[PDB]
Structure 1
Amino acid sequence: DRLLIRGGRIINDDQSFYADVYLEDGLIKQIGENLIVPGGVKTIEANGRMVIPGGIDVNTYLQKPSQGMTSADDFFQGTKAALAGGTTMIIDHVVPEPGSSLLTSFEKWHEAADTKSCCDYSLHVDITSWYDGVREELEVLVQDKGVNSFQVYMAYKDLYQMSDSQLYEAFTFLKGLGAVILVHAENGDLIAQEQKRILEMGITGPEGHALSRPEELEAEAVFRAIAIAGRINCPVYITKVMSKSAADIIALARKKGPLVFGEPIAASLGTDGTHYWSKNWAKAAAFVTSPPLSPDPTTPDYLTSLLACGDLQVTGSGHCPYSTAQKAVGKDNFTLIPEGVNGIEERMTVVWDKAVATGKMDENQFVAVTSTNAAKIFNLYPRKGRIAVGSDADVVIWDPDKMKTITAKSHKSTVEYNIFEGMECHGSPLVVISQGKIVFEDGNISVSKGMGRFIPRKPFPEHLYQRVRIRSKVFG
């Protein structure tokens, strides 16, 4: 259906300018000084408000398994929540069941999302084990299924953990396929050692989670992953950056040569781990995620600073909350608490408040860290993350001047708690458009279950492999 947005200020990552935008059949058809559309056309008066590209959440775990329980917000509830918060595309993590192949898991996820997602989506495939034959499936996932990104774990001893030798093999094989390599960086062996010790001191509450996974163990894994990537000459992406230490490791590496990217999430940009010490067991348990929120209160402002100067490039949510009932399964042993916090709905609002409202970065840089950088890294650029003729009509009309107190009573998540409870933000979504259709307006959501399309991605993203290709020919 034809839709005209008039009087708006278009904000892309490279510049801002006034013009109207004309949408038709999921595409941006025209941008220009004034008029040019048929007489019958629904019209939205932006009246000076910002017209920006819909957000791309590079990290979601909507159907994540944890302690035998599935994350609380499914593909429907989850994407509905995303759209209400201004995010029009997600890249969800496929997590294979024990003893299941990668192709079987992809098919399960794909079928699931296709029947419930309210918006467009892509899929990451989590390689939980380097088994004989995995190489063939990966080739099929890249070449035929359209999956260009994969994650390997450095933590979760005896479960998902990959040894240095296996990590070297995986990075090498993945680079050959032109894939984007993601890492969950925490030293699992040392974490296992600390869990035992902490539980021995009689510490059973959530604070035990933070205490068994100190940031020094995250930073160390990040460094080791960067060392491997550097020897292999392949890009490496660090998911869920939660600490000042890990962030500095990445910063230092960037000026050295290694092609390393950093992904902080809403949680680490908007709150901290002091809440693991709440008297209320349920509130504390709701903050349990891995890596954990840093107990150092200076962390959120510091990570935002690094995102502003370019040492960190994209923002995600790591969304995968569990209800109090599900969390309670470990009311006694903190190591039995399902891991995951909310943030898919709050991401763009939280980033705007902590980065733009404070003056650390401007609106153009806001677009880059919420969509454009993500698009260039995962090979979806022009199509997504840019208001331009020919791109997909995933648009948001943002109003920098007002409204937003984050509360569990008004959020879209099905869970009881919210790690950003009480946070008042200045700047939020007014109108959300996906696939050329209005899904959020006048403070209300209007979605269609299953309307979302799966977006396949080609390997060898230029932003990543151009430098890789030169280096392989210059340093042989």
Structure 2
Amino acid sequence: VRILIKGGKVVNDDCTHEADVYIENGIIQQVGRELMIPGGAKVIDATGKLVIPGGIDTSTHFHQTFMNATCVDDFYHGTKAALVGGTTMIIGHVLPDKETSLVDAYEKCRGLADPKVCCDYALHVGITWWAPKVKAEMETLVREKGVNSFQMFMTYKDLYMLRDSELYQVLHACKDIGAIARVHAENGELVAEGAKEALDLGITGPEGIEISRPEELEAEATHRVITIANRTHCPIYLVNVSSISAGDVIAAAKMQGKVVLAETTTAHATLTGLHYYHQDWSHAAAYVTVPPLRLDTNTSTYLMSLLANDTLNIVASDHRPFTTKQKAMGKEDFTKIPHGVSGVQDRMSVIWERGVVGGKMDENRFVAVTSSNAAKLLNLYPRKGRIIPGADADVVVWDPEATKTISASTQVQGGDFNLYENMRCHGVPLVTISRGRVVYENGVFMCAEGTGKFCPLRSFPDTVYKKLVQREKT
């Protein structure tokens, strides 16, 4: 399959230039103004369009059972939805139950994904308890199974939560093997007490998700894990950053030279918690995730600014849709509403609209936060996240002058609601190319299940570790 993308502007995270792109055998072969190529190529007319690295979504939960509900999208449907939305790689989550094997949970995931994915992928592994067995398994995963990133929780007391002593040991273990420590930082003791107290106060509706875990619980846990990480000399990556208070902690730490990276989600960057107070229970429940969307109307604008200014590095969907019927497990008790929202298909368009069209960042910074920063952290740059010769041919022809009104009735991602219903969004993937084949064009998707491949992720990504390895020389 030989593809010539003609007439567009190549947009990488560093700059934009007019150039044609020639793809063959899964790889970008040439980029330049006037290309000499063999005849017979599929020609895509990208006049007026931007030719960008396909999106890399660093947080997705295809096929995951969580809080007794099973995500509506499996690996085929999730990756299809990602491609239609202009994302060409997904990183999925493995979440072993406490005191169960990390490797078994990883293998189960590999089995669900390998025969089904439409696009390239890799996996983060959840560290949900600690013991010498767990440490050995971390070493195995990094050495043999193409993992370089672990996910920890400071919340979910009695299910997934790690205590300070255990985080210390975890982070020490991650740095010794060159892994990235992702952490969900909310104070789990206080979250547990807050939910019990909210229920006692008769707050049983979805707004309990906000009331029971005010932002100071995030700011506190964020401060604490950054301190633990600085003492262990481990790089720390905060996830689902949701609040001004937490953002301010991260910015203060970075100011002091601490080795801190952070991700937010589309929803936290663009939506407010007023959705929890909607008159329709089902609408309100669809927005329930953690940390929750905050009521302060300035929060989404602030987080967008931080994404533009590199206080936050990366934006992910955190895609974990449930049906209305599954969400309704919590109809009489908000603590049982399963945490999760839809977004894998929405991410690129929503961030283009609120970020770029809204004047918060430019097109190059859009590429950085949707693909290039992630590729770097993943140790896959410039194989991914960059339009250059030699890179993987994961490419999106992006129409910056098309709008689509977003609606659940027209989406292919799972869920009964779309969080961005009726939003007019001015940026559209016109063509999605994955592994050097057109998989989405003229509004039609086509790609066989299992076409995508697992991409092993190598330890010690320079973007983080070159600096750290140098500090420890003294």
Q: Distance in 2 between matches of 1:98 and 1:222?
A: 22
CA distances 1:223-270 after superposition (whole Å, capped 9, x unpaired): 101011111122100011111111111111101011111101111112
Q: How much has 1:98 moved relative to structure 2?
A: 5.0
Aligned residue number for residue 258 of structure 2:
258
Aligned residue number for residue 295 of structure 2:
295
Aligned ranges for residues 37-186 of structure 1 at < 5 Å?
37-97=37-97, 99-186=99-186
Q: What's the TM-score once normalised by structure 2's chain length?
A: 0.98
Q: How much has 1:471 moved relative to structure 2?
A: 1.5
Q: How much has 1:460 moved relative to structure 2?
A: 0.4
Q: Distance in 2 between matches of 1:463 and 1:98?
A: 31
Aligned ranges for residues 197-276 of structure 1 at < 5 Å?
197-276=197-276
Aligned residue number for residue 375 of structure 1:
375
Aligned residue number for residue 366 of structure 2:
366
| Contact map agreement 1:403 1:426 (CA 8 A) in 2 | yes
Aligned residue number for residue 323 of structure 1:
323
Classify the secondary structure of the residue corresponding to 2:181: strand
Letter in 2 for 1:233: H
Letter in 1 for 2:183: V
Does structure 1 residue 421 correspond to structure 2 residue 421? yes
CA distances 1:305-351 after superposition (whole Å, capped 9, x unpaired): 11111111111011101100111112111111111001111111111
Pairs aligned (count): 474
Q: Distance in 1 between matches of 2:368 and 2:24?
A: 25
Q: How much has 1:35 moved relative to structure 2?
A: 3.1
Q: Distance in 1 between matches of 2:292 and 2:255?
A: 27
Letter in 2 for 1:380: L
Aligned residue number for residue 465 of structure 2:
465
Q: Distance in 2 between matches of 1:191 and 1:309?
A: 30
| Contact map agreement 2:97 2:159 (CA 8 A) in 1 | no
Q: How much has 1:429 moved relative to structure 2?
A: 1.1
Q: How much has 1:213 moved relative to structure 2?
A: 1.1
Does structure 1 residue 386 correspond to structure 2 residue 386? yes
Q: How much has 1:136 moved relative to structure 2?
A: 1.2
Q: How much has 1:444 moved relative to structure 2?
A: 2.2
Aligned residue number for residue 15 of structure 2:
15
Q: How much has 1:360 moved relative to structure 2?
A: 1.6
Q: Distance in 1 between matches of 2:194 and 2:320?
A: 25
Q: Percent identity?
A: 52
Does structure 1 residue 306 correspond to structure 2 residue 306? yes
> Structure 2 unaligned runs (5+)?
none
Q: Distance in 1 between matches of 2:428 and 2:48?
A: 15
| Contact map agreement 2:342 2:414 (CA 8 A) in 1 | no
| Contact map agreement 2:242 2:264 (CA 8 A) in 1 | yes
> Structure 1 unaligned runs (5+)?
none
Letter in 2 for 1:87: T
Q: Distance in 2 between matches of 1:212 and 1:220?
A: 15
Q: Distance in 1 between matches of 2:417 and 2:38?
A: 48
| Contact map agreement 1:182 1:238 (CA 8 A) in 2 | yes
Q: Distance in 2 between matches of 1:167 and 1:75?
A: 31
Q: Distance in 1 between matches of 2:423 and 2:298?
A: 17
Letter in 2 for 1:154: M
Q: How much has 1:402 moved relative to structure 2?
A: 2.2
CA distances 1:119-178 after superposition (whole Å, capped 9, x unpaired): 000100011111341111111100110100001110001111111010001000111010
Letter in 1 for 2:222: V
Classify the secondary structure of the residue corresponding to 1:402: coil
Classify the secondary structure of the residue corresponding to 2:250: helix
